[PDB]
C-alpha cells in the first residue's frame, strides 16, 4: 500500500483534499470512493484499517472526509468522482459510512460506471438524519451541526433538503446495482432499523452483514478490519 494526499476542485472552484490509498498492483482491480465520518473519532484508525484491507485485495481507495473536519454537499462527492474519472479510473465501487452512506446511495444512480455500492451505519430516511442534526447559527449561511457521538461537525442544509427531495428509498430501489449494507445491532446513533428499511427498499442483489457489538464509529479496529475484508471480497464479484 502507498498513501497519497490529493487535491481537486468542485464546480465552484473550491479546493477539496482527500487521501488516495494505492495497492501493490500497478493496475488496481478497481478504484473506490469512500465517503466517511470516521474523522468524528479520536483517531483515523477505523478508516485506515478498512482502506488497508481493500488495498490488500488490490483496490485503490479515495477516502473523502464527509465531515469537513480534516461544509459538505452532494456536489463535493460528485467532484471526487470526477477527479477519479479524470486522473485515475471512474470508480467502480462506492462506499459510504454514516451520513456518507446516505449520500453515496443517493448519487450512485448518477454514475453508470459504479458497479457496486456498500454502506456502513447508513440512515434510511430524513427523520433518522434529523435525529443527528440541528441548524447552525447563520452569519456563512445555510449550514447545520451534526452529532454522531464524537467530534461534532458542520454540513450544508442543502444536503438534507436535497436528500429529502430525491428520496433515498426511491434512489435505492432504482439504483440497479448490487448493494451491501453493514450495520451494528447495537448502534446507538443510527438504529439498526435503518438497515432493514434500506434492505426492504432495495432490489436484488442486496446483502446485509451484521456488525454484532460494534459502535457507530467502529472504535474496535477488529470490526473495521472485518468490514474492509468482507467488503473487498464481496465487491470483487462485480468490479472485476
Numbering used by the authors: 1 to 70, 82 to 150, 153 to 253
Describing publication, verbatim:
Carboxylesterases (EC 3.1.1.1.) and lipases (EC 3.1.1.3) catalyse the hydrolysis and synthesis of ester bonds across a large variety of substrates. Esterases generally show promiscuous activity with a specificity for either the alcohol or acid moiety. They are members of the α/β hydrolase superfamily with most using a catalytic triad of serine, aspartic acid and histidine in the active site, where the serine residue (found in the sequence motif GxSxG), is responsible for the nucleophilic attack on the substrate. We have described seven members of a new family of serine esterases all containing a C-terminal OsmC-like domain taken from extremophilic bacteria from a wide range of ecological niches. An enzyme from the thermophilic bacterium, Rhodothermus marinus showed particularly high activity, even at low temperatures and was subjected to further kinetic characterisation and crystal structure determination.
While the full length OsmC esterases were recalcitrant to our attempts at structure determination, the putative esterase from Rhodothermus marinus, EstRM, was crystallised as a C-terminal truncation comprising residues 1–255 of the 410 amino acid full-length protein, including the alpha-beta-hydrolase domain, with a C-terminal hexa-histidine tag. The structure was determined by molecular replacement to 1.56 Å resolution. The structure consists of two molecules in the asymmetric unit, which align with an rmsd of 0.35 Å in their Cα positions over 225 residues and can thus be considered identical in their overall fold. Molecule A has visible electron density for residues 1–70, 82–150, and 153–253; while molecule B has visible electron density for residues 2–70, 84–148, 156–168, 175–253. ΔEstRM has a classical α/β-hydrolase fold, with a core β-sheet made up of seven parallel strands (β1, β3–6, β10–11) and one antiparallel strand (β2); one face of the protein is flanked by two alpha helices (α1 and 8) and the other by four helices (α2, 3, 6, 7). There is an insertion in the α/β hydrolase fold between β6 and α6, which is formed by α4, β7, β8, β9, and α5, encompassing residues 136–180. The inserted domain between β6 and α6 forms a lid that completely occludes the active site, with a loop formed by residues 160–165 sitting directly above S109. The differences seen between the two chains in the asymmetric unit and high B-factors indicate that the lid region is likely to be flexible and may act to modulate the accessibility of the active site. The structure of ΔEstRM has a partially occupied intra-molecular disulphide bond between residues C135 and C210. This disulphide links α7 with the loop preceding α4, stabilising the position of the beginning of the insertion domain.
